[PDB]
Amino acid sequence: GSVQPSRDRKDKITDKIAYLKYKDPQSPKIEVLEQELVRAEAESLVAEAQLSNITRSKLRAAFNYQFD
Amino acid sequence: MHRTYSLRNSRAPTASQLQNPPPPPSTTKGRFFGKGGLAYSFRRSAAGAFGPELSRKLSQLVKIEKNVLRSMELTANERRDAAKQLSIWGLENDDDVSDITDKLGVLIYEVSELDDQFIDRYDQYRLTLKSIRDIEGSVQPSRDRKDKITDKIAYLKYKDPQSPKIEVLEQELVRAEAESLVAEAQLSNITRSKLRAAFNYQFDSIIEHSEKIALIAGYGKALLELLDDSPVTPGETRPAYDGYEASKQIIIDAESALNEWTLDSAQVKPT
Amino acid sequence: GSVQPSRDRKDKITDKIAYLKYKDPQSPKIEVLEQELVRAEAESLVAEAQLSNITRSKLRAAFNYQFD
């Protein structure tokens, strides 16, 4: 639940980028917002990878303990 | 800077300074804050107080550059007015004097319009600096978050090393660090590219303006040669003036040369 | 002035297409609006060509008559 806000920020920033591009494709904020979107995306895909890893490990350990 | 190793706030005279003594300092240097007013100073200070810390200096640079552009356009307009009213004064004079001052007014008009073009290029360069300021000041909060989260992690570890939030906060710190080191790399890349491009554009505009002004000055001196500086003895008549055609061709050639000037046509050869 | 509304419609429809694409890229109206944009564009570029032709002809004839 603490890794969720990373994807929340990614979705918000991509929506903002789409809206800005539609409103003004030549706006100076397009480039900086695009860099920020890239940065959140690098923040987010690999965060999904880590989340899958930790979820698998924690679930397996907890359920093994519970079944024992 | 030309200062030699001495405590003197004076530089060794150059070849031009050796040719003739330098003129005395300007008499218009009055006593004030050294800049004229206070509103732009307040704007500069606000740029130096409210903005993000690491982008504050570049925002101040952008504001000061805007001030420079404002002053340059104002002085270009004032030079245009000065040329116009100088030729206005020269209207009621000798016909040779009237023609020479009129052509000089046109030449200063050309200088003013070239200054305006250079000002447009200078504002384009300032906009590029604004762009690099924007991207870098928007990449600053990544490191801001990294510092905040590492401080929070240190405080939590000191307060409770076994707190469950330690692991999730550590993952978040790793994540901001992966977000931040490579963001520094990208910032360095974009800063290098933008700075090189903007300064190359600015220096190209500078050399173009300098060469055009130099050609204007040379043509103006050649046209001043046309002026008859020989004094007439008291009580004598005025010799007839016939320099309309010569100045006619001179201004025609000046316009043709200004059209013909290209970036490669620059004859300045640094060594 | 009667050929101007063709480009007016072209601009309006391209703005509408951009807004719809930003709002909903998967909207069913995208394809029909795109066909309509193509159609106005085929209506408009060659209309510009014809307008240039008729403008040249009319201007030349009228000014020749006036100067005569």
Chain B hits for A36, Cβ within 8 Å: 138
Contact: chain B with chain C (3+ CB pairs below 8 Å): no
Q: Which of A10, A6, A14, C14 is nearest to B168 (CA)?
A: A6
Resolution in A: 3.7
Q: Do C21 and A21 count as a contact with CB atoms less than 8 A apart?
A: no
- Read off the tokens for B126: 């300032």
Q: Do A19 and C22 count as a contact with CB atoms less than 8 A apart?
A: yes
Contacts for B219 with CB less than 8 Å, ≥ 6 apart: B107, B250, B251, B253, B254, B257
- Read off the tokens for C44: 């408009």
Identify the DSSP state of C3: S
Q: Which of B41, B169, B181, A22 is nearest to C19 (CA)?
A: A22
Q: Which of B105, B99, B111 is nearest to B227 (CA)?
A: B99
* B185 close contact with A: CB closer than 8 A: no
Q: Which of A3, A39, A38 is nearest to B170 (CA)?
A: A3
Contacts for C17 with CB less than 8 Å, ≥ 6 apart: C30, C33, C34, C37
DSSP secondary structure letters along B115-149: HHHHHHHHHHHHHHHHHHHHHHHHHHHHHHHHHHH
Of all residues in chain C, the one with the smallest CA distance to A19 is C22
**Could you give the CA distance from residue B261 to residue B270 in angstroms, rounded to a whole number?**
19
Q: What is the distance between the terminal CA atoms of chain A, rounded to a whole angstrom?
A: 28
* C16 close contact with A: CB closer than 8 A: no
- Read off the tokens for B78: 């004032």
Q: Which chains touch A (3 or more CB pairs under 8 A)?
A: B, C
Q: How far C19 CA lies from chain A's nearest CA (Å)? A: 7
Distances (CA, A) of B106 to B98, B216, B251: 12, 10, 9
Chain A hits for C19, Cβ within 8 Å: 22
Q: Give yes or no for a contact between B58 and B195, defined as CB atoms under 8 angstroms apart.
A: no
Q: Which of C43, C21, C45 is nearest to C31 (CA)?
A: C21
**Could you give the CA distance from residue C64 to residue C11 in angstroms, rounded to a whole number?**
36
Q: Which of A26, A30, A28 is nearest to A17 (CA)?
A: A30
Of all residues in chain B, the one with the smallest CA distance to A2 is B168
Q: Which chains touch C (3 or more CB pairs under 8 A)?
A: A
* B171 close contact with A: CB closer than 8 A: yes
**Could you give the CA distance from residue B187 to residue B193 in angstroms, rounded to a whole number?**
10
Closest partner CB to A31 (pick from B135, B172, B178): B135
**Could you give the CA distance from residue B82 to residue B66 in angstroms, rounded to a whole number?**
24
* Residues in chain B, overall count: 271
